[PDB]
């Protein structure tokens with residue numbers, strides 16, 4: 001049968017038909033004789049490779065298979081893998097390794113200490129000891145990434161292994177299925193349910209793993225029965241709730257003191273699918289005001305152990321959310337009032353304000369559109385001004401790693417052809433993963449790229465305001481032509497220097513059959 005044939009049989013039997021890669025010499029014996037039932041998505045830089053696969057996996061809610069070249073190709077993808085760890089993203093990262101006979105010699109393209117290079121961003125890293133073990137190793141790689149908490153995994157395979165004969169017992173791997181859909185036992189669950197019904201002013205914090213689980217609808221019901229406000233946890237990688245539902249309270253501030261003040265007055269605070277408050281800024285204070293008890297449901301033991309406060313349960317987010325929403329009694333309390341409609345900012349005929357750009361997206365864009373965010377100074381306004389009523393409608397780099405949104409948008413749009421993907425990316429952020437645009441052109445993935453050009457790293461200048469950071473170099477990015485960049489990679493390029501220009505550009509981009517980039521002149525932060 002051979003390792004090559006057996007592995008490709010194992011991948012299809014495990015449901016994988018797509019390979020996101022940038023080719024290399026160690027990868028040719030694996031890439032050769034490519035099965036007709038598989039499809040290869042090529043990106044020009046390995047950060048783009050993983051980013052595309054990442055968005056594809058997050059929207060599909062299935063594993064994604066990557067093929068990179070040795071250490072150099074693995075190294076270029078490490079920033080993406082960092083984002084891919086904090087988003088519990090099921091990624092099977094494979095890298096070709098030199099012939100076993102020359103690894104000790106360290107011949108050119110040898111990945112030295114290969115399993116250590118991904119760490120500590122990968123749940124599992126491995127280099128098989130024997131060619132016939134490779135399929136088994138791939139099997140571990142798939143399940144490791146698939147099993148909760150979902151995470152990136154790494155497998156280095158010497159290129160001489162693919163032609164060798166596979167183990168005849170490797171066929172037992174093909175139909176292996178491991179379940180993680182677990183929930184709290186009835187006795188402890190009923191205790192929790194009794195505490196939610198007893199709470200006089202409960203509150204719900206929802207994290208990215210809620211959207212990863214597609215537990216949004218269950219979380220809506222739970223919020224309705226509890227008649228409880230709902231916040232999305234800070235540094236949110238995803239949107240787990242309808243942003244215009246009367247219970248939704250918006251994006252929590254990323255500060256210790258600021259979160260405990262918001263939570264003050266709620267006896268029970270139920271967190272689901274979220275790390276227990278990840279803070280960006282140092283806002284020292286009380287983690288919790290007195291009279292507030294916190295219960296956290298998480299798929300990740302690291303999150304449960306990490307918490308500075310509260311109880312925690314390590315279970316499946318989907319199974320827990322569905323159990324809690326169907327078990328709780330409907331509260332007599334009145335439903336919370338929907339947050340106020342956002343105000344319209346003054347907009348002259350000149351450079352566009354971010355608020356105006358987000359309002360124009362909301363009226364113009366489809367109700368089932370998918371948004372992506374790498375405009376770091378405008379996140380607060382984007383959450384307020386974009387009505388996202390459906391799951392899988394928002395993605396933001398989980399670890400804050402720039403270069404995610406542009407390639408990921410191509411991956412999401414590939415995963416969801418029926419939904420229109422609009423990526424709002426700031427200037428400067430677009431540079432990290434710029435080559436990915438080519439993949440959208442070559443495969444005609446019709447992602448819309450909206451570039452917010454202010455000529456600066458807006459968030460960095462704003463933050464340098466918090467604290468007296470004066471005379472900080474490297475904060476301005478003047479003189480980039482994004483329409484020229486989009487042409488270089490074959491993406492149709494549009495511009496928008498005013499509102500009417502923006503309105504027209506958007507209507508055109510929505511009608512386009514190919515990818516489109518719109519460079520937007522925006523006002524400085």
Ligand SMILES: Cc1ncc(C[n+]2csc(CCOP(=O)(O)OP(=O)(O)O)c2C)c(N)n1
Pocket residue numbers: 079374375376377378400401402403425426427428429430432454456457458459460
């Ligand atoms: C890979 C990486 N490099 C650098 C940073 C630091 N960083 C955080 S926000 C930011 C500015 C982003 O620029 P832009 O898209 O213009 O954002 P805005 O003007 O909206 O703040 C930078 C450089 C990062 N988070 N990740």
Ligand SMILES: [Mg+2]
Pocket residue numbers: 426427428452453454455456457458
């Ligand atoms: Mg900017």
